[model samples]
Target: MKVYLRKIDNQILHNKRISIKKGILEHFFDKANNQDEVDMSGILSNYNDKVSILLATDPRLGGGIKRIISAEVDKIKENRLDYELKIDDILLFTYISYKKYTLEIILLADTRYNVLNGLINNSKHLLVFSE
Candidate 1:
């Protein structure tokens, strides 16, 4: 599937046009404008189709976010693949620091979409759990 940004006059707003390469949901609070909302859910639901999501709130995150991450990631691990979904390609969203964004991400391509490539130069929040 191709990446599309719903922009008007070629400008993305409402937390849109995020990085397709790494599935990065970026938030920049200028602390000067009228922007004050930092809901990560927007980025989570930006996709045009149905999906089972895996959310891992990094240590920097809070508000009982980890519970949802664990639940969703646990839930989204749909071991049964759907052959009907024409499998697209994969991308990576590497969370980096000290060149340590080595943490692999979670995604389902086609009916199972692979995430974008390692592309986090900054930090948001997430986790890489073990079985």
Candidate 2:
């Protein structure tokens, strides 16, 4: 599982600056009702691919913005290892207090693709945790 840290860009983050949308709340219910995963890629696009994400929110900065840390993982190249997804890696996104910026840490196999996919898909779910 490969790991990657991404920074939130100013513009996109600003767009998400407002309070959480009502539809987002309804979407959460919909996801719970259907037991389906929510997608968050749309909101995550505001970040720079190079920096790590910080998950915490700051009312002084942006109250409802969401952050994500991404990565990808694959089997070892030698010995003809089977191609399978392993959740071995651990990624963390934490907010910095003084700067009001997000800090991200990526650790694990190196599967950035999978991590990104998960973040995108689960962005809406994060809102539930915020409240």
What lDDT tens digits, residue by residue, belong to model 1 across residues 38-123? Answer: 22221232222111222333111223222333333343345534322111222222222221221111343333232322321123
| lDDT by candidate, in order shown | 0.24, 0.30
lDDT of 1 at 10: 21
Runs with alpha carbons beyond 4 Å of true place in candidate 1: 1-59, 80-115, 121-131
Which 10-residue span in candidate 2 carries the lowest summed lDDT? 70-79
Candidate 2: regions farther than 4 A off:
1-93, 103-111, 119-131
lDDT of 2 at 81: 58
Compute the lDDT for candidate 2.
0.30
